[PDB]
Amino acid sequence: GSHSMRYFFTSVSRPGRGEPRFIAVGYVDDTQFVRFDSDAASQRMEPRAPWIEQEGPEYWDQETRNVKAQSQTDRVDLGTLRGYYNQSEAGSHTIQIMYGCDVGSDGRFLRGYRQDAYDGKDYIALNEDLRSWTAADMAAQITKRKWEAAHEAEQLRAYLDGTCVEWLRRYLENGKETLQRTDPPKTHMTHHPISDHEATLRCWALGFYPAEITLTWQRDGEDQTQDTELVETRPAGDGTFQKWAAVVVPSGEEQRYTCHVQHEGLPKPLTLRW
Amino acid sequence: AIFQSSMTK
């Protein structure tokens, strides 16, 4: 199937309390594999999945060098952006960055992306053509003119549709047993009366991977969105995910309600009924 | 592997 590699960077300023907190994490699909924590003793990019551990000293040196460089870029940007928004030296502020690439089941490039945020709000984003930028406000338009002038898009594109893909393809193979799997949802239904008039039906999806999934309820074929209670997909902690959707139904009419489950690991969508 | 050429805003 298709796959992605994504890196996430968070820098949080700590006025009076030293350098900004910097945390980087890397994912292949929904599996994390590396981290860097500016507050940790090692000051090294660290492995976070068994299959990345086999990378040699040159790899960890390279990632450590480069992840530090990223932190220093972002640290300086915190000052710049504070100035752009005319904010005080006293308050804490956050820069978040996400970038990555997707490949098809043939290992070929599908698309690339990068988005930057300030204080949890869009700042600047690379467009789908990987040649142009979208600035969210007047401050970001300054950054945009700067990056257009410096041909930043071309450099990032060379990474997104080049080296990003090559590494992703390598990771996909070294981590094959973990990454090229699809664990279908183990599904079941629960049922509990709430009164003489109504009962709760909860449709469960457990132990699935990747996290992408869809649970929908229907009534005599009609979409029940939403007298439906639907929780966020959540990590089980063992590399799989969980999710449930529930409806409150008229006492004795459970037979009309169907839960529909869609997931990459299922040859056909499932239908559950009480 | 991460992007090797971060550029300031």
Binding site: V12, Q32, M98, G120, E232, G237 | -
Partner: protein, 100 residues
Amino acid sequence: MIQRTPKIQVYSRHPAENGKSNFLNCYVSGFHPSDIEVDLLKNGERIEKVEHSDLSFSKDWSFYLLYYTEFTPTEKDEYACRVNHVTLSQPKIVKWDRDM
């Protein structure tokens, strides 16, 4: 920027079976800023040994974290998650409910 309160789920890694070892999860998501503390409680007492995931964030820039520890569920025992975040006038405590 208006700060975002965390969503909180408390649950188990595997279906709960009294007397059988399992893992207790507290998943905190949708919060901003990233500074936060999460503790797991057994009958009101904080569990000493608890681990958590590395800080990451979602499409909408809100952060998410998983905290977890080993536990053996029973009928008598009560478990909960206590979240401490700047958006919460006081730490929010959420009880574990086995089929939530």
